[PDB]
RNA sequence: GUUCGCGAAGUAACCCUUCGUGGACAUUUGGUCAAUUUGAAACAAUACAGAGAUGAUCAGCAGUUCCCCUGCAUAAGGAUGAACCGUUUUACAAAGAGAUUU
């Protein structure tokens, strides 16, 4: 409700509230992973990520049906 | 062929026959169409695939069409019945700038 009143995402609101009132281990599941910052990648790529971008370009390419391709 | 006569001949006698002869009755069917190849139904078999919006598998309702089929149909089916998916240029003008000619 508060984040709706401020037109800001709620995770930003919670962390900034913690910063106002102030003045993770390994092997845990992070529930807040979608709201958190991304991880940039190692220089070459992983193999599964090469496969992912290949099939992603292949699925973003096609704009036809079965009848039209035939 | 029937019927009403009108004459001759046979027996006649008023009938019954052969024969000629005038009238009456009855009066135009059928084809749009000829009997095996050359004037027009079509499917089915061998071969290939194995159904639209899909990443995959499907329910469908429509629409437009000089395509229709099954159906008693103005119902409903036929893969949502199917074809639909391509090719794409001019009602062409205004202001400014740079070179050629007068
Ligand atoms: Mg249809
Ligand atoms: Mg139908």
Residue with tokens 């009143």: A5
Footprint of strand B on the protein (CB under 7 A): A 59, 62, 65-68, 70
Q: What is the DSSP string of A1-58?
A: -HHHHHTS-HHHHHHHHHHHHH---TT---TTGGGS------SS--HHHHHHHHHHHH
Nucleic acid strand B: bases within 7 A of protein CB: 51-55, 83-86
The closest alpha carbon to A20, from A12, A31, A28, belongs to A12
As given in the structure block, the two tokens for residue A63 are 């704009």
CA of A63 to the centre of ligand 2 (A): 28
Distance CA A70, CA A55 (A): 22
User: What phi, psi does A68 have (nearest 5°)?
Assistant: -75, -35
What is the rounded distance in angstroms from the CA atom of residue A29 to the CA atom of residue A31?
6
């Amino acid at each position: 409700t508060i984040a709706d009143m401020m037109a800001r995402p709620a995770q930003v609101c919670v962390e900034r509230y913690n910063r106002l009132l102030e003045s993770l281990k390994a092997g845990d599941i992070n529930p807040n992973a979608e709201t958190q910052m991304a991880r940039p990648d190692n220089g070459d790529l992983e193999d599964e990520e090469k496969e992912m971008l290949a099939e992603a370009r292949a699925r973003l390419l096609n704009t036809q049906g079965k009848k039209a391709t035939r």
